Amino acid sequence: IYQTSNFRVVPSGDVVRFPNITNLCPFGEVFNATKFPSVYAWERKKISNC
Amino acid sequence: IPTNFSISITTEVMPVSMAKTSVDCNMYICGDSTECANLLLQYGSFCTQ
């Protein structure tokens, strides 16, 4: 018996994980709110960087 | 001159073998990096020795 080289198992797949929310968008706060303006006096939003 | 006898038994511990160790220098040094192994190959065949 003569030692010749070393064997290695080449990885086939790949696993990448990410955190839960990472500053989730406040869409949920605007969707299910408590006060909603009328149709003639509707108010928009400026949701950005979410 | 002795007049009787005394059959005694003694012990003696002597090592005859040790731990058969085997260290893979390809995994000890440069575990999974490719450029690390490329630079290690420049130093010669020390791992084979």
Swiss-Prot record, chain B:
Function field: Mediates fusion of the virion and cellular membranes by acting as a class I viral fusion protein. Under the current model, the protein has at least three conformational states: pre-fusion native state, pre-hairpin intermediate state, and post-fusion hairpin state. During viral and target cell membrane fusion, the coiled coil regions (heptad repeats) assume a trimer-of-hairpins structure, positioning the fusion peptide in close proximity to the C-terminal region of the ectodomain.
Included range, full protein: 696 to 744 of 1255
Gene it is expressed from: S
Residues bearing carbohydrate: 4
Consequence recorded when altering residue 48 to A: In strain: Isolate SZ3
Domain of life, per lineage: Viruses
Listed name of the protein: Spike protein S2
